[PDB]
């Protein structure tokens, strides 16, 4: 088959700051009839992949100008001027000269932009919710820049870490940022057996984490 | 109009086939050949099949022994249905254009011998508000569902900015999703802020408008 690699597995850059990335194919990408079939594609996170370049070099309706394709044969590079916050996503090479119609493996475009501290927020289980045989609390810690966070929960001081479901946003095509909620999940009477309930959030901004938290007995 | 909208279902039992409409607008598929191309999470894109204006086809060999790509020139659609699917062959499956690259929307295929659980929708709203006339952020909960696909909005659409669904987590063999939505202090009491809901495979719409409340 036509072995496509992209060798940029994961690629963090500043908006503005310019960026390639290359892909390689284990047979020439030249046809017969002349041309050199090679696509570079964008799948953004959700949406579906959108093609910004064909032939090589030509550009798609729509697609910026600051993108510029290159290359021949099994080397063909794609290059983006200078790197907007709508760039983020991944990024494939396909090649269609030879029947398997083969893709690139990814390259992960993140975009570096400064840090940022989480703005969390803490929300109790919904009576709609304790109705039934449990009673979730989840809390939101949002817009924070590196990824990389941990919240630890916290029943009256005892520090909870069963019951608790973590889930990252990935990067935001607009502020940039990363997001992420924890749903810690009690027994409806194992719940309000208790008072306080805390959600804490150690990133990078500071040395002593974020804590979020409320109090059964006030509002 | 150049668009290629999609459909089949979003469960399957093992072995049982699958079974995709792609019904493409605004070209000629006698004029264009439609690939099929599908995403293994965490995998990729990779190439299942095509079939040409001239109706001829091309599979991937690794799939050629249960893939059957047929279309219909005038209805303006193409049939994907593959056959002995197992649950490693759970992926969104694609339809996209040969030429001028249109994709379709993606239909997700699950393939376990599992319950269609109609998820539970409940609000999150915050014990206390904030007095500085900054923000306030209410959220949103989708517990108990099986086939993930689900779709989730604010206010349908109008409230589109602050808006952050994360992706559902799946614990003892149910998926959880979660949105949240920080509009400014004033807000809030003023505009009425609701979370539409919608687990397609359970014919399930609901609609929860984040309301007050204090303990």
């Known amino acids: 088959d036509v072995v496509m690699t992209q060798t940029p597995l994961t690629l963090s850059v500043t908006i503005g700051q310019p960026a390639s990335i290359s892909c390689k194919s284990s047979?020439?990408?030249?046809?017969?009839?002349?041309?050199?079939?090679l696509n570079w594609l964008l799948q953004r996170p959700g949406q579906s992949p959108k093609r910004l370049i064909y032939?090589?070099?030509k550009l798609d309706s729509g697609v910026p100008d600051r993108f510029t394709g290159s290359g021949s044969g099994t080397d063909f590079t794609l290059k983006i001027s200078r790197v907007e916050a709508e760039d983020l996503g991944v990024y494939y090479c396909?090649?269609?000269?030879?029947?398997?119609?083969?893709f690139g493996g990814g390259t992960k475009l993140e975009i570096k932009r400064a840090d940022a501290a989480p703005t969390v927020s803490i929300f109790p289980p919904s009576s709609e919710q304790l109705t039934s045989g449990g009673a979730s609390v989840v809390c939101f810690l949002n817009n924070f820049y590196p990824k990389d966070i941990n919240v630890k929960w916290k029943i009256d001081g005892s520090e909870r870490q069963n019951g608790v479901l973590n889930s990252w946003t990935d990067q935001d095509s607009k502020d940039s940022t990363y997001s992420m909620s924890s749903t810690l999940t009690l027994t409806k009477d194992e719940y309000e057996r208790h008072n306080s309930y805390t959600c804490e959030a150690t990133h990078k901004t500071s040395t002593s984490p974020i804590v979020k938290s409320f109090n059964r007995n006030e509002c | 109009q150049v668009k290629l909208q999609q459909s089949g279902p979003g469960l399957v039992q093992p072995s049982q086939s699958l079974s995709i409409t792609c019904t493409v607008s605004?070209?000629?598929?006698?004029?264009?050949?439609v690939h099929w191309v599908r995403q293994s999470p965490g995998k990729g894109l990779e190439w299942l099949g095509v079939?040409?204006?001239?109706?001829?086809?091309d599979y991937n060999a690794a799939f050629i022994s249960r893939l059957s790509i047929t279309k219909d020139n005038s209805k303006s659609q193409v049939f994907f249905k593959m056959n002995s699917l197992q649950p490693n062959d759970r992926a969104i499956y694609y339809c996209?254009?040969?030429?001028?690259?249109?994709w379709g929307q993606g239909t997700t295929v699950t393939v376990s011998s599992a319950s269609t659980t109609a998820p539970s929708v409940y609000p999150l709203a915050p014990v206390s508000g904030d007095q500085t006339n900054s923000s306030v952020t209410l959220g949103c909960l989708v517990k108990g569902y099986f086939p993930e696909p689900v779709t989730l909005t604010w206010n349908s659409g109008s409230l589109s900015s602050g808006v952050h669904t994360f992706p559902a987590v799946l614990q003892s063999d149910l998926y959880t999703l979660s949105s949240s939505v920080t509009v400014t202090s004033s807000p809030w009491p003023s505009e009425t802020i609701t979370c539409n809901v919608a687990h397609p495979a359970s014919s399930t719409k609901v609609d929860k408008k984040i309301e007050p409340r204090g303990c």
């Open positions: 396909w090649q269609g000269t030879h029947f398997p119609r083969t």
């Open positions: 996209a254009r040969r030429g001028g690259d249109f």
């Open positions: 605004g070209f000629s598929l006698t004029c264009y050949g």
């Open positions: 079939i040409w204006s001239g109706g001829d086809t």
């Open positions: 032939l090589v070099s």
């Open positions: 047979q020439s990408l030249l046809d017969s009839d002349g041309k050199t079939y």
